[PDB]
Design an enzyme around this catalytic site. Sequence first.
Site, PDB file in Angstrom:
ATOM      1  N   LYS A  78      49.047  35.341  36.102  1.00 23.21           N
ATOM      2  CA  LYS A  78      49.115  34.608  34.684  1.00 23.21           C
ATOM      3  C   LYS A  78      50.152  33.705  34.543  1.00 23.21           C
ATOM      4  CE  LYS A  78      45.343  36.565  33.300  1.00 23.21           C
ATOM      5  NZ  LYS A  78      44.344  36.187  32.347  1.00 23.21           N
TER       6      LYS A  78
ATOM      7  N   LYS B 137      49.608  27.138  33.740  1.00 28.99           N
ATOM      8  CA  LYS B 137      49.266  27.672  35.066  1.00 28.99           C
ATOM      9  C   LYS B 137      49.114  26.756  36.122  1.00 28.99           C
ATOM     10  CE  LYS B 137      46.121  31.035  33.326  1.00 28.99           C
ATOM     11  NZ  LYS B 137      45.777  31.612  32.136  1.00 28.99           N
TER      12      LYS B 137
ATOM     13  N   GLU C 115      37.873  28.863  35.445  1.00 27.93           N
ATOM     14  CA  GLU C 115      36.654  28.172  35.069  1.00 27.93           C
ATOM     15  C   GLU C 115      36.934  27.532  33.656  1.00 27.93           C
ATOM     16  OE1 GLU C 115      33.449  30.771  34.830  1.00 27.93           O
ATOM     17  OE2 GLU C 115      33.197  30.737  37.036  1.00 27.93           O
TER      18      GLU C 115
HETATM   19  C1  FMN Z   1      35.274  31.845  39.018  1.00 28.64           C
HETATM   20  C2  FMN Z   1      36.493  32.607  38.014  1.00 28.64           C
HETATM   21  C3  FMN Z   1      37.236  32.275  36.978  1.00 28.64           C
HETATM   22  C4  FMN Z   1      38.167  32.623  36.102  1.00 28.64           C
HETATM   23  N1  FMN Z   1      38.636  31.928  35.429  1.00 28.64           N
HETATM   24  C5  FMN Z   1      39.688  32.509  34.673  1.00 28.64           C
HETATM   25  C6  FMN Z   1      40.546  31.899  33.660  1.00 28.64           C
HETATM   26  O1  FMN Z   1      40.015  30.673  33.190  1.00 28.64           O
HETATM   27  N2  FMN Z   1      41.709  32.109  33.139  1.00 28.64           N
HETATM   28  C7  FMN Z   1      42.063  33.373  33.619  1.00 28.64           C
HETATM   29  O2  FMN Z   1      43.215  33.800  33.157  1.00 28.64           O
HETATM   30  N3  FMN Z   1      41.533  34.198  34.807  1.00 28.64           N
HETATM   31  C8  FMN Z   1      40.631  33.878  35.094  1.00 28.64           C
HETATM   32  N4  FMN Z   1      39.834  34.543  36.104  1.00 28.64           N
HETATM   33  C9  FMN Z   1      40.365  35.543  36.587  1.00 28.64           C
HETATM   34  C10 FMN Z   1      39.249  36.794  36.404  1.00 28.64           C
HETATM   35  O3  FMN Z   1      39.358  37.433  35.007  1.00 28.64           O
HETATM   36  C11 FMN Z   1      39.843  37.947  37.319  1.00 28.64           C
HETATM   37  O4  FMN Z   1      39.141  38.025  38.757  1.00 28.64           O
HETATM   38  C12 FMN Z   1      39.379  39.367  36.817  1.00 28.64           C
HETATM   39  O5  FMN Z   1      39.949  39.745  35.775  1.00 28.64           O
HETATM   40  C13 FMN Z   1      39.690  40.433  37.749  1.00 28.64           C
HETATM   41  O6  FMN Z   1      41.027  40.564  38.067  1.00 28.64           O
HETATM   42  P1  FMN Z   1      41.751  40.264  39.511  1.00 28.64           P
HETATM   43  O7  FMN Z   1      41.341  38.799  39.873  1.00 28.64           O
HETATM   44  O8  FMN Z   1      43.140  40.619  39.445  1.00 28.64           O
HETATM   45  O9  FMN Z   1      40.945  41.501  40.374  1.00 28.64           O
HETATM   46  C14 FMN Z   1      38.660  33.937  36.890  1.00 28.64           C
HETATM   47  C15 FMN Z   1      38.291  34.417  37.790  1.00 28.64           C
HETATM   48  C16 FMN Z   1      37.050  34.100  38.629  1.00 28.64           C
HETATM   49  C17 FMN Z   1      36.396  34.554  39.962  1.00 28.64           C
END
Ligand code: FMN
Lengths: 217, 217
Positions: A14, A74, A165
């Site tokens: 984050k 970020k 995204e």
């Molecule tokens: C395609 C994609 C888009 C994401 N977009 C965001 C986002 O805009 N902001 C964010 O804070 N996390 C984002 N994430 C993080 C996801 O929420 C995260 O993969 C999920 O909470 C699981 O946690 P981890 O990645 O620590 O295992 C995104 C993840 C993916 C795969």
Amino acid sequence: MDIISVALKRHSTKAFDASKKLTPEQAEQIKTLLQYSPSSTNSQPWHFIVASTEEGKARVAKSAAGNYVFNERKMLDASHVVVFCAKTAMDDVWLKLVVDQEDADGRFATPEAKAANDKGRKFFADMHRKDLHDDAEWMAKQVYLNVGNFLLGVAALGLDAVPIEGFDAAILDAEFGLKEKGYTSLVVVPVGHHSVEDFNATLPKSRLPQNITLTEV
Amino acid sequence: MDIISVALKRHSTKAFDASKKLTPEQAEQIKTLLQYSPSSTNSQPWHFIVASTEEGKARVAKSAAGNYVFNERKMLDASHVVVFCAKTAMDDVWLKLVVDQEDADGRFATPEAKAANDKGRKFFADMHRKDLHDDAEWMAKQVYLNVGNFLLGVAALGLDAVPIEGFDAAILDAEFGLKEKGYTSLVVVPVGHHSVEDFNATLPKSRLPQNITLTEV
Ligand SMILES: Cc1cc2nc3c(=O)[nH]c(=O)nc-3n(C[C@H](O)[C@H](O)[C@H](O)COP(=O)(O)O)c2cc1C
Ligand SMILES: Cc1cc2nc3c(=O)[nH]c(=O)nc-3n(C[C@H](O)[C@H](O)[C@H](O)COP(=O)(O)O)c2cc1C
């Protein structure tokens, strides 16, 4: 380390430490991961924008100016920010560019092997752009495969990243003139080292139980 | 040997050795890989089918019909066969299942922090579900991201694998009743050990040059 160890310890960060930059070696490795990712029929329907400068990063951060402001820091504090882009249409010029590159790399022994390979790619390509009219969605999936490969690749290098995204693709595509060039932004992935303000780094990982999502036979 | 080496040496295996099966530890490892993959908002819109028996593999192999008879051998000779499936629609109950899972895992300090994560998810959900009307595509993109994570992962474990899009989804879905459960097969990944007949294991790797796919700023 254990690839399972990195899989289990990685997390979407984050907050990034603006002071921690990637070494020229890591910056090179990161680009290698983007290039060598697999794709259906080795079609590689993508383009990547690696921002390293502050002006470059700020140009990207321009896409999160709307209601996606909580994402700006970020894209600014991270060392390198990579935006994954996909082709808007599968054309014959791109398919020729691929098999000709496969030929240059010595993958075919005869000229018939090359023809057969080109015919085989055309089978899939035409199936999407002619029959199902979904070649754009087809290519978009290949890019997401690349992001998946990428996120695990960086974690294994010891770097922190977060997939995003939440950004306006319309503004992003406009700022970089993409898709006049035949591309559209999909995912923005900031890469660097996390700071202390990243609470997600000390939180436990969460996923649904295997008895819900997995079927064995 | 770091991941760059892993990404440069891996390949789409064309022939599998039926005698070389996955070790018991390796079976639990690829499952852990499947589940621990990231996804937008941790929505995890997926389901997997891991076939490891002759009966199970033959059931999947049925999808390798008509124009895709060339992939039948790969599905039957690989030790384990994974079918990556995506949900057909995003339903509120599944969104609830995800939030309550993160909660039971200790990811929320207060009940108001849990709700904020819920509305945060529902925001992205309704975006594709209600506004854009492309949630089926959005969820499938997250599944292709799992494949990218899975491919690099098994290669890191020392296994050979091959992403397969060439198969009849309608047959595979019907054979496993996925349709009425709200899922659709999208990618089939046979994993195991390549045999000496796998010519792809000895050919040079080929990717487009970065001067075409990459733009630095
Ligand atoms: C395609 C994609 C888009 C994401 N977009 C965001 C986002 O805009 N902001 C964010 O804070 N996390 C984002 N994430 C993080 C996801 O929420 C995260 O993969 C999920 O909470 C699981 O946690 P981890 O990645 O620590 O295992 C995104 C993840 C993916 C795969
Ligand atoms: C989504 C996807 C689908 C693929 N489908 C097939 C397939 O049906 N049959 C096959 O033999 N190879 C298939 N491949 C392998 C690709 O041709 C391969 O990734 C590409 O030629 C690059 O070679 P490499 O994976 O060995 O680096 C597929 C790859 C991907 C990513």
